[PDB]
Chains A and B, each alone.
Chain A
Amino acid sequence: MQNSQDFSITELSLPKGGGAITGMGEALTPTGPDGMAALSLPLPISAGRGYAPAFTLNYNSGAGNSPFGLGWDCNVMTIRRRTH
């Protein structure tokens, strides 16, 4: 805002209906210089009080079989011994 901030809270306005129909949150992604076909599909985690877990499911060709099946994972943040 000119000489103000967009972090300001000024309204208690209610939501409107109509518009385009909501999709399933599909997010097919561009590959990198790797050609690793991939697809993101976020979980509906929206209850945070400005802060929440942020898991999404992600398909990545060549990925192994995780709790989400072959080729898909959910990125739980971890630290591990390198087994490479």
Chain B
Amino acid sequence: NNNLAFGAGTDTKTSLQASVSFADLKIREDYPASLGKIRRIKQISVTLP
């Protein structure tokens, strides 16, 4: 789940799909468990420098 590939769908065979595991980012480890175990997305922004 951490790869680059062209999409399988017909409309996507020409689309480059950049994929990462969300889970593998290990964001959770950034803060100690005592802060609460429920950690959920509020909003994601995209940057292409």
User: A contacts B directly in the complex (CB < 8 Å)?
Assistant: no
> What residues of chain B have their CB less than 8 Å away from a CB belonging to chain A?
none
